[PDB]
Short mmCIF file of C-alpha atoms in Angstrom, two decimals:
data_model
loop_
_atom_site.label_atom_id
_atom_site.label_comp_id
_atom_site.label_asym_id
_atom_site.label_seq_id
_atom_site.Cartn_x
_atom_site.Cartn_y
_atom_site.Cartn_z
CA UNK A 2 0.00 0.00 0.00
CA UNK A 3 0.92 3.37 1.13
CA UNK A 4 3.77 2.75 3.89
CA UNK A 5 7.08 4.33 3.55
CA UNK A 6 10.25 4.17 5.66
CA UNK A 7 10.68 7.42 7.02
CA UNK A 8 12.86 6.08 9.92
CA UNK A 9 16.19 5.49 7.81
CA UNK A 10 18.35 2.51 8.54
CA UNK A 11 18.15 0.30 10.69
CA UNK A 12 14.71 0.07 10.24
CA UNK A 13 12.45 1.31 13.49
CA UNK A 14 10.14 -1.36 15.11
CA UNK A 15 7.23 0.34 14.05
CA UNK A 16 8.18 0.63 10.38
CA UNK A 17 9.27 -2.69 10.77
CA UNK A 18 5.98 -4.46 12.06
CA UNK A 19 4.23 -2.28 9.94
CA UNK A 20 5.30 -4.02 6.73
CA UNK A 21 5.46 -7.60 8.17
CA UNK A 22 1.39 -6.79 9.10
CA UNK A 23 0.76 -5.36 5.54
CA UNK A 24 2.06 -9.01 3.99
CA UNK A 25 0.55 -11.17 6.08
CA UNK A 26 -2.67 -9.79 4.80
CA UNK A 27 -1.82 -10.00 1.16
CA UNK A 28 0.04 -13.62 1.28
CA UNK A 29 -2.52 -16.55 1.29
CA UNK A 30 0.09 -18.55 3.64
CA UNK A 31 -0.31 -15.52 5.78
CA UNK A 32 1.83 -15.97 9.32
CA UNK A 33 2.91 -19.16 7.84
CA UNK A 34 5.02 -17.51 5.84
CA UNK A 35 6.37 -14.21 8.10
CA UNK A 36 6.86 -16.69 11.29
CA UNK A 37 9.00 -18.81 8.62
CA UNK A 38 10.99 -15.85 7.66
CA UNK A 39 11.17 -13.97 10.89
CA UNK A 40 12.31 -17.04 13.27
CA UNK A 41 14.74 -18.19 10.81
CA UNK A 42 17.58 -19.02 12.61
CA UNK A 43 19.72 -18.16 10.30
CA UNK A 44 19.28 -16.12 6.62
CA UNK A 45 21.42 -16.63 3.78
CA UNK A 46 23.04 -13.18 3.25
CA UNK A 47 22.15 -11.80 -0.37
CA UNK A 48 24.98 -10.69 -2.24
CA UNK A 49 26.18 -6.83 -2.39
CA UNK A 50 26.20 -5.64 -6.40
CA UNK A 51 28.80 -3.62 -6.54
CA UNK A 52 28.14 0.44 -8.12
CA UNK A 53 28.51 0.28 -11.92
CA UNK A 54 31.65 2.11 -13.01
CA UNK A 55 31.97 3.35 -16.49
CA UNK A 56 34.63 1.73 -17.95
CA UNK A 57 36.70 3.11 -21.61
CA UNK A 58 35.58 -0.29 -23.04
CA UNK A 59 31.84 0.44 -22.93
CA UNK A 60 29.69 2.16 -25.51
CA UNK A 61 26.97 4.54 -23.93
CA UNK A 62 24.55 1.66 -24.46
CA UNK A 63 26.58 -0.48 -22.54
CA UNK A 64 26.65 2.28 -19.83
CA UNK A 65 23.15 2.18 -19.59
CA UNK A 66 22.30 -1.38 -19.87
CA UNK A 67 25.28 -2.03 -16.65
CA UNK A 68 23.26 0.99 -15.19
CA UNK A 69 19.88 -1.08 -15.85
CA UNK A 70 21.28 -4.36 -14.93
CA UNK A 71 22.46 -2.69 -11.68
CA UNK A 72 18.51 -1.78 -10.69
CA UNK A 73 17.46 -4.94 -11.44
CA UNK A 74 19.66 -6.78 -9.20
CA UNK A 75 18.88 -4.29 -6.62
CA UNK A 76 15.37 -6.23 -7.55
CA UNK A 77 11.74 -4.16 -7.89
CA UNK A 78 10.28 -3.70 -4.15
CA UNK A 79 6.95 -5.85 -3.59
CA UNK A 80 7.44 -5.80 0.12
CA UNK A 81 4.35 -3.11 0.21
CA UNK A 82 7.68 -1.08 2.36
CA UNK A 83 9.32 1.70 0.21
CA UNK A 84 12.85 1.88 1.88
CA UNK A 85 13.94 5.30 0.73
CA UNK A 86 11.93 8.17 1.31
CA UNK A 87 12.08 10.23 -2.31
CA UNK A 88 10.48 13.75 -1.69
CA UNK A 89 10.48 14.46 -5.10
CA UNK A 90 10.69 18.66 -5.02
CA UNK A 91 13.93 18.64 -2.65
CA UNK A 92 16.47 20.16 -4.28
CA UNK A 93 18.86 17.98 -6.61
CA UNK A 94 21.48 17.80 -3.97
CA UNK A 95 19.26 15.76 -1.14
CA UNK A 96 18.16 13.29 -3.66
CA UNK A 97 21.60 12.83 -4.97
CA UNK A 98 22.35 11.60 -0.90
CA UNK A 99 19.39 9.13 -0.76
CA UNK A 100 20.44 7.81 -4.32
CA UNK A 101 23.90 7.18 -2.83
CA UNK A 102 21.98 5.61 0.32
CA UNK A 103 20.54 3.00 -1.80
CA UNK A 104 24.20 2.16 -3.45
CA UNK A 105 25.08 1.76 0.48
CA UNK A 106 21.81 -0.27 1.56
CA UNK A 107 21.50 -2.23 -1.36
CA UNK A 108 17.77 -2.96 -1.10
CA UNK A 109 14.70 -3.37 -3.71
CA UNK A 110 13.23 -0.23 -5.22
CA UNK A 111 10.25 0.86 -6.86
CA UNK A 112 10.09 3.46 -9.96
CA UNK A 113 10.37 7.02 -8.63
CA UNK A 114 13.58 5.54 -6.39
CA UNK A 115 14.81 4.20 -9.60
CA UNK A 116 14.84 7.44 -11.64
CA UNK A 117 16.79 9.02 -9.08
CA UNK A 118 19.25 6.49 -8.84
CA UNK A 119 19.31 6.62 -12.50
CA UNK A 120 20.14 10.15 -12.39
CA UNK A 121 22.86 9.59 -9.86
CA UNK A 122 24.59 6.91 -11.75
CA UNK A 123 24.36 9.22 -15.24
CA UNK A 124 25.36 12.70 -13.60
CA UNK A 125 29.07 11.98 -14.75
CA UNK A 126 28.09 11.27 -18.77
CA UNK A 127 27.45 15.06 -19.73
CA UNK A 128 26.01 13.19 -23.78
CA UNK A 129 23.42 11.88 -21.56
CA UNK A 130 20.35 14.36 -20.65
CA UNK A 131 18.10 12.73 -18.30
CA UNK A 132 14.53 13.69 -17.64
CA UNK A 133 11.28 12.45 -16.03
CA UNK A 134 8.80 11.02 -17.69
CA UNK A 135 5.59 10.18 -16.00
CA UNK A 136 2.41 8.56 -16.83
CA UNK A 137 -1.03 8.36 -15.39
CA UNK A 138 -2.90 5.07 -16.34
CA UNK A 139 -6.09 3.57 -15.87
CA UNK A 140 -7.28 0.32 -15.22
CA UNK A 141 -10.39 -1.48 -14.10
CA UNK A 142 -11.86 1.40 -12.04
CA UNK A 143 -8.57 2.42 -10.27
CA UNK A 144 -5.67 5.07 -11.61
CA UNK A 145 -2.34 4.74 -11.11
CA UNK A 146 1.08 6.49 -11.45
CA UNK A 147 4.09 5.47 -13.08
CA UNK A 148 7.92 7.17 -13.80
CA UNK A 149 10.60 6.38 -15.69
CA UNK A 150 13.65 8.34 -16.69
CA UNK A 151 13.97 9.37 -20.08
CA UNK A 152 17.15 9.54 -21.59
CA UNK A 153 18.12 11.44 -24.94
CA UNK A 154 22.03 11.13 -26.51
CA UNK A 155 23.26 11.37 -29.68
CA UNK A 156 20.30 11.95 -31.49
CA UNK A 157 18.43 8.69 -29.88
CA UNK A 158 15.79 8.21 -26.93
CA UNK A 159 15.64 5.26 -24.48
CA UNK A 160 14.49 4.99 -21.08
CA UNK A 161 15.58 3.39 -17.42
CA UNK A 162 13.67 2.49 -14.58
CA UNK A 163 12.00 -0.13 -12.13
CA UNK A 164 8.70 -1.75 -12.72
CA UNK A 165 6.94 -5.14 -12.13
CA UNK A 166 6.27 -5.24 -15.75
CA UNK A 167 9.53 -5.46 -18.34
CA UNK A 168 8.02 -3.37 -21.26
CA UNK A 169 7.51 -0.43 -19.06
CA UNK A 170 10.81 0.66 -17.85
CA UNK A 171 13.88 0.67 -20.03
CA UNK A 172 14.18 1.33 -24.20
CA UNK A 173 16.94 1.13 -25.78
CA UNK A 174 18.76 4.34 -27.11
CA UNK A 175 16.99 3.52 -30.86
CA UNK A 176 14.22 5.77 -31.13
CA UNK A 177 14.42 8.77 -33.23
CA UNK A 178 12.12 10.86 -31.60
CA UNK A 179 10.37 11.64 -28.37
CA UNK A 180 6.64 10.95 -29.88
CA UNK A 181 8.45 7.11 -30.36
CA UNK A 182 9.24 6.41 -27.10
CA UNK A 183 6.03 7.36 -25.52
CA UNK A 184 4.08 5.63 -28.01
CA UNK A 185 6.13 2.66 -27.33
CA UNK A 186 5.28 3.17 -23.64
CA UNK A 187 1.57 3.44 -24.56
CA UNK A 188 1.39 0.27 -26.92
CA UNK A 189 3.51 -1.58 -24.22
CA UNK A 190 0.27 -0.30 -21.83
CA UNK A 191 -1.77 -1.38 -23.68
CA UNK A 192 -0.71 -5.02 -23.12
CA UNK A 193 -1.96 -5.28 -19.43
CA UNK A 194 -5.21 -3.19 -20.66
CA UNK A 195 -4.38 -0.05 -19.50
CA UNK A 196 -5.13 3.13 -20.67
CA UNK A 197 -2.91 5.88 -20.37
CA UNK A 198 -4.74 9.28 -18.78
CA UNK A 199 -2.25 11.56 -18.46
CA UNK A 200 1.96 11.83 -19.96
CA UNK A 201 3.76 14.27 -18.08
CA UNK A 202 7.60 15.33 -19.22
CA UNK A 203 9.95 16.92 -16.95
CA UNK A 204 13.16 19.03 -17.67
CA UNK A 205 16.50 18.03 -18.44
CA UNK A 206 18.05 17.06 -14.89
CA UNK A 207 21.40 19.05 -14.23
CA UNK A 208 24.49 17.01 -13.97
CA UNK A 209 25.54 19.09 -10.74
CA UNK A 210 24.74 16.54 -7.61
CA UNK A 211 25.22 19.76 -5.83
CA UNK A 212 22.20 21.35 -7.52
CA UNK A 213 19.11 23.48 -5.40
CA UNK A 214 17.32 23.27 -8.04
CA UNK A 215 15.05 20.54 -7.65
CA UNK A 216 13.70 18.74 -10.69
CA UNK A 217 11.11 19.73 -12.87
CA UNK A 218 8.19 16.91 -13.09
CA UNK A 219 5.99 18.64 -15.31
CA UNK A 220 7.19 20.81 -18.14
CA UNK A 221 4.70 19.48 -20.52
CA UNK A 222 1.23 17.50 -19.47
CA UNK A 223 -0.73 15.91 -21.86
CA UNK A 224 -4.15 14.82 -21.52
CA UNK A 225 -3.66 11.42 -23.69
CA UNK A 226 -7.02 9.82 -23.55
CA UNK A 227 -8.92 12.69 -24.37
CA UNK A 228 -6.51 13.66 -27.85
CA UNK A 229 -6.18 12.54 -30.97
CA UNK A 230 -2.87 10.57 -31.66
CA UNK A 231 -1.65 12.57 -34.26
CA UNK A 232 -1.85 15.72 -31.68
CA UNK A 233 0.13 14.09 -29.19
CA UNK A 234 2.36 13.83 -32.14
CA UNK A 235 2.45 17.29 -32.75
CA UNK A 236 2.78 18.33 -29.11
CA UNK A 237 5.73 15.99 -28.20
CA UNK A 238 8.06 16.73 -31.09
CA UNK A 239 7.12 20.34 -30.48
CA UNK A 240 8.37 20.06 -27.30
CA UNK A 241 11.08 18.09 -27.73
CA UNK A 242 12.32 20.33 -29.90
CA UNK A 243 12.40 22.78 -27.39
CA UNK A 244 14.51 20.90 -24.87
CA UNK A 245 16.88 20.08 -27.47
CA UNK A 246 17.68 23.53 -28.73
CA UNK A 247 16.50 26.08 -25.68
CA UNK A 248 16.93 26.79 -21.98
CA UNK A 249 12.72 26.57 -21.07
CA UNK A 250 12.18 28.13 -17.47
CA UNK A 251 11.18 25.54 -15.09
CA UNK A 252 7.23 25.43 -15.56
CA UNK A 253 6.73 25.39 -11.74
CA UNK A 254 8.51 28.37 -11.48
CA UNK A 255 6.38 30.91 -13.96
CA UNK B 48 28.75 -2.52 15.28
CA UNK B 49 25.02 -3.48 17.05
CA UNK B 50 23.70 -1.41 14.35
CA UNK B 51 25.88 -3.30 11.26
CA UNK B 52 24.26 -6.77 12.32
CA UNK B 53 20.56 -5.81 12.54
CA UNK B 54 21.25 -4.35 9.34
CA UNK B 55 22.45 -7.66 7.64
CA UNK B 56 19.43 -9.38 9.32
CA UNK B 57 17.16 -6.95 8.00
CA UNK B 58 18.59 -6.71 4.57
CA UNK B 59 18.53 -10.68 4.45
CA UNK B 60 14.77 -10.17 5.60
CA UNK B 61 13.53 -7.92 3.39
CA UNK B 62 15.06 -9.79 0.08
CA UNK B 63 13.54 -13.10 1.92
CA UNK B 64 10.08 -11.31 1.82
CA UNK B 65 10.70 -9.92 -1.36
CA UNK B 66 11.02 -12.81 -3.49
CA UNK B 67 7.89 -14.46 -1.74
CA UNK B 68 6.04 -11.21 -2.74
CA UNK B 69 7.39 -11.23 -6.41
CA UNK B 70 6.98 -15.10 -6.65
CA UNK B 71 3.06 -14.24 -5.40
CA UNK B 72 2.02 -11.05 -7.83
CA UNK B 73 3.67 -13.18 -10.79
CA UNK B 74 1.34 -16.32 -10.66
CA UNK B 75 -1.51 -13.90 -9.91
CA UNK B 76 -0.50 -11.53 -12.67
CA UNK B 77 -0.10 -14.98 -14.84
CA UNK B 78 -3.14 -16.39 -13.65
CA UNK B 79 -4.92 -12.99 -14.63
CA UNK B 80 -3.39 -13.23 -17.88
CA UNK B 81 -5.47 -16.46 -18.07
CA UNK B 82 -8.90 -15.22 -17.15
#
């Protein structure tokens, strides 16, 4: 549900019983399966993943991908427990510390944790611009809200980020234009019969971890389900085009 | 360090939990792809 660590790490008791209550009510085996865990005697001790480093025999591709392969290892959180508080408006500088956290932790995220350690990991690649893109979906009477991090270098957008599903988190650096990508996001909703409500870009992210600026989230929103396709079309590339050629003010400051 | 050890016992918790929790929204998201 709705429970987030906001006591750091080591996890508080009441954090802590808080989560192992929220699965025992999901899980059929119920306390069968949290006594069996808790009163282990003894845990085997996941392995560490080391931090990606970027190495002179990788492309940018391979950058990302190691980046990618990175969060998956980390593993997507189902615990119901996000670990690391994101407060999304802080300035760049405080998320850049609780993206570092999770290098130190080493524990599962879920998407909005995984853009910011994507940005973290990519704020040394200057070719790389990173930005937010969100999505509000729809399904079978309930909405829901989704992030990835877009990525745009040398003339090609791709993605990163953390989901339950594989289709909606990273793309390859192979499509030509903005419009692609989120109609590849869209089509890959599609899939698990969900329609998208809302696409919301963000600004490029600065490369300075030492930023106060906090990121932009929503530069550009579109209203998806209520447009034509050929409009979003028109209103991606458009601005796009923008981001690629201009320094836009920060939408939530004007 | 106290503090070190609970947080090895935790970490082996939580990825303990979390691969029951992935194992369970898989054969329900499977099982869903089904009906």
């Amino acid at each position: 549900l709705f429970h987030v660590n906001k006591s750091g790490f080591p996890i508080d008791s009441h954090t802590w019983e808080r989560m192992w209550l929220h699965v025992a009510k999901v899980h059929p085996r119920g306390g069968e399966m949290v006594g069996a865990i808790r009163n282990a005697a003894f845990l085997a001790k996941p392995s560490i993943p080391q931090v990606p480093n970027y190495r002179l025999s990788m492309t940018i591709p391979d950058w990302l991908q190691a980046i990618q392969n990175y969060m998956k290892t980390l593993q997507y959180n189902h615990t119901g427990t996000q670990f690391f508080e994101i407060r999304k408006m802080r300035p760049l500088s405080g998320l850049m510390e609780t993206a570092k956290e999770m290098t130190r932790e080493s524990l599962p995220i879920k998407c909005l944790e995984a853009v910011i350690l994507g940005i973290y990991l990519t704020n040394g690649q200057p070719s790389i611009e990173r930005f937010p893109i969100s999505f509000k979906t729809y399904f079978s009477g309930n909405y829901f809200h989704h992030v990835v991090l877009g990525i745009y270098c040398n003339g090609y957008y791709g993605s990163l980020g953390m989901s339950r599903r594989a289709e909606l988190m990273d793309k390859p650096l192979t499509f030509r234009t903005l419009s692609d990508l989120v109609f590849d996001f869209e089509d890959s909703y599609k899939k698990y019969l969900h329609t998208v409500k809302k696409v919301k870009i963000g600004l490029y992210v600065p490369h300075e971890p030492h930023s106060f600026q906090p990121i932009e989230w929503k530069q550009l929103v579109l209203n998806v389900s209520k447009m034509l396709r050929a409009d979003i079309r028109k209103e991606l590339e458009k601005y796009a085009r923008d981001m690629r050629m201009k320094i836009l003010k920060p939408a939530s400051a004007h | 360090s106290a503090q070190q050890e609970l947080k090895q016992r935790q970490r082996a918790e939580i990825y303990a939990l979390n691969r029951v929790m992935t194992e369970l929204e898989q054969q329900q998201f499977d099982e869903f792809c089904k009906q």
